[PDB]
Design a protein around this ligand. Sequence first.
Ligand SMILES: Cc1nc(NCC2CC2)nc2c1COC[C@@]21CCN(Cc2ccccc2F)C1
Ligand SMILES: C[S@@+](CC[C@H](N)C(=O)[O-])C[C@H]1O[C@@H](n2cnc3c(N)ncnc32)[C@H](O)[C@@H]1O
Lengths: 378, 373
Amino acid sequence: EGTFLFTSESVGEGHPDKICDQISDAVLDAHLQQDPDAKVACETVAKTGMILLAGEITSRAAVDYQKVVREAVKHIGYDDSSKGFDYKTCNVLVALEQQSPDIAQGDRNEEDIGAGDQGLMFGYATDETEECMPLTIVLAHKLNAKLAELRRNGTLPWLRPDSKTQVTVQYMQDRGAVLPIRVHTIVISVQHDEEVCLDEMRDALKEKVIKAVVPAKYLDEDTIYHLQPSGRFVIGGPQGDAGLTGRKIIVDTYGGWGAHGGGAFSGKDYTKVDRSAAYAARWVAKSLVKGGLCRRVLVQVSYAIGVSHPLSISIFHYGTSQKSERELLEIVKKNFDLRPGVIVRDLDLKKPIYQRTAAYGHFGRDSFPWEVPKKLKY
Amino acid sequence: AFIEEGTFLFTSESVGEGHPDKICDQISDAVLDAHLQQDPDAKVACETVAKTGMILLAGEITSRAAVDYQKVVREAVKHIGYDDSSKGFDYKTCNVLVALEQQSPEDIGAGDQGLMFGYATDETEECMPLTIVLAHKLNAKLAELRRNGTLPWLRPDSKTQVTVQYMQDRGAVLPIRVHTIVISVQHDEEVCLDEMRDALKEKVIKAVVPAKYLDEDTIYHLQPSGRFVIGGPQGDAGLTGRKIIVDTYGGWGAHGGGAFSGKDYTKVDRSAAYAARWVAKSLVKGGLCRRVLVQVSYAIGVSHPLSISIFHYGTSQKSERELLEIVKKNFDLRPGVIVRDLDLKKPIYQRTAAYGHFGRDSFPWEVPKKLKY
Ligand SMILES: Cc1nc(NCC2CC2)nc2c1COC[C@@]21CCN(Cc2ccccc2F)C1
Ligand SMILES: C[S@@+](CC[C@H](N)C(=O)[O-])C[C@H]1O[C@@H](n2cnc3c(N)ncnc32)[C@H](O)[C@@H]1O
């Protein structure tokens, strides 16, 4: 037939894994506000009544970690025992040292600073949406964003921060391109208070959330809706659970499409090529699709610690381009300088913009420089 | 130029047992194995956190077992090789913080609407990409020479990265040569740089990478930072489940998102991921394909897979629907049945927490099933 199903997941800000991501990037932004050259590698752990920060920081900034964390938890929305977590009374432990001096040494100009680590990173784009992202992860992200929006404007006051969404879309293949046909299944689980009744929640999730996010041409009579499938969900977040920074990296990127090199984003400054090179790889892929050179493209780059030039660069257009992959590679080499010291300059990665990225996806939102396509010259 | 037009590069990485992320994976699965030995029906979701002098255990456990976490943690760190403050971490004196919430206590449906991927390629004997296989064995050779006194200046923390130059071959991929090798390993304060870099090329790389893949243009980045004395948890905080691509296919195939270590077999994204690899490897080893991606969809509540797609990249003489009918005649991919067929209630998981979950004969999902059709 040539038709397949694909599912992508997205979680809300209250998910324990995402709490750690946002806190880690909140610590990063705090240092960057005072020291644009701060070295930050801040991991976060969240369990019952605890937030723990562990990692390495080299900064001239004076940061109040107790208040940075508690304001992030407050922003996420956990302010009472009835929700399972409260920023006012939770335990905050800090185990932050200085960056390894062996790491810092391995003193040089801005344009050929070596990568802070080895690693491989992927970039991906697809013309199936105007965001150049897969429809499954775009819909999953926007659904969690609509839940938080309706929670914060008081129109659905029974909502709570923890949530998880899964969107299954039926796809058609066409010479390497993918055509979304219909939404097969939507799953939504969201934390809620004790007063609201189950049936009222499920109807509100369909009329006020799904219908407000999913275009009507993808929903039909056979679409399956799994709304609050586990029944009650009064307590969520870190209570009775455990979350870690960088445990939602597929949620953070392409929701299972493309490829992933394993590196996590949150809590890492721009010198960590896990973040800066992944943002640049998305920049390249989106510029190739928006520029009309392909319908769907995957990009890989890799680095070695202390070396500035990428060790390998590869392009794959899935057969959606008239031009061969090698000349796509040259168009990239002529338009992009993928050294980490040049990426930070081109993408303006010293700004405290990273707490915004820790939820609803790092890719597919016009607010970010790596999402603005580059006018290609060749 | 003729070579440049019909050739691509691909890079994968791996890390050693002393890498702080892998320390946590190892300890989390050691906790899982400890509970499974006494209680084969134990439910485990154990996260480990590693920083300077600290191992922290957090998560939820429902088990009848009585596990000495001090002994399990400190013996895992001892096995890894951190036994003195001169190495940045010591199992005898490190702080072990236990924050686990322990509770005392087939048609099992899927707890998540998830996607599981299995992948296999005939480019190596273990049916795995050469990039991730070479990267894995390079770390293993380091630990082997460290533990038997051959290179006594070695230390447990290490990272490797391999870039292979490939040629396409009728939908299958064919390794031509090793383009670039990166090795960084922790070391003591006395051995010199030139001595380290020569032993890494002569006694590590050439003992692992076949000679036909190495030439005079192969690029070597050996100890590229120049000094790797500080390592392990002291030089970098480590968390469970931060090496899921190292754990799987090194960038090839696809990945759904879930980590493996610290979770018992009732977690579908671990047991079914193993079964997806089991299916793909059986298709290639059975001659049905040279290269295949098995894509299994699970509908919430439902036990049987909701949909299975087979991407053979045109390397199969049969069609996708034919391959699908062969899979369903030879595999029962329900989660509860997967556990029994793969004997997953055994304490076999600490061995998986390093050097890759896929590509080693000593695992039930790596024994290809002979297909009847
Ligand atoms: C001519 C070509 N070039 C490349 N350039 C390597 C690159 C872009 C990253 N890759 C490929 C081909 C043709 O042959 C098959 C694949 C091999 C890799 N595949 C792409 C892929 C699929 C799934 C997960 C990760 C992947 F990189 C396509
Ligand atoms: C480079 S560190 C990530 C950044 C680091 N955590 C920081 O504080 O900025 C990632 C891995 O590199 C390895 N590593 C640590 N020190 C190194 C060094 N001096 N040279 C090469 N690799 C090193 C460690 O195994 C560590 O797990």
